Amino acid sequence: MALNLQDKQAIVAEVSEVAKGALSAVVADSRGVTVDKMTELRKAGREAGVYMRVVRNTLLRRAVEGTPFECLKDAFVGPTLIAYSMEHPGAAARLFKEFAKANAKFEVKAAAFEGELIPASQIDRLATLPTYEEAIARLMATMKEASA
């Protein structure tokens, strides 16, 4: 490994994603294959490319060293194996969705999805999301309200 001069970058970089981010998910990759990463990188791909991460770090000692910053709801995620996912642009989006759909294709556990932060809380798969731009679901709420 590297000394501190390097354990600091994995911090100053990874914590300015939290400081400058959008949504957060969860997942434990016990059996995390590489067809695994391959896929989810195309997903990050659709979800821009390299706007997304997953930098395995669940050393509390790392991606909690980014938490007493923001998201101290994660002192509780960080135990055991974890795969932290941050969003920069994009809706508070679909990121959420396929992690459940992925891991529900066996694709290993999902930490039961211990969940995360947009609010400041816990678990439950939501597509309360990428409807986003479904302001059309407030366009159809126009003419249909005007007519009916």
């Binding site: 302001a135 407030r138 126009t142 005007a146």
Partner: peptide, 30 residues
């Protein structure tokens, strides 16, 4: 209110205008 006076603007408008707006149209009614 005037329905045409709220269609001419309600088909043509910006973006982030809406993004910090229709996370809340859901609130007054629904």
């Amino acid at each position: 209110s005037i329905t045409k006076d709220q269609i001419i603007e309600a088909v043509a408008a910006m973006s982030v205008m809406d993004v910090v707006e229709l996370i809340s149209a859901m609130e007054e009614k629904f």
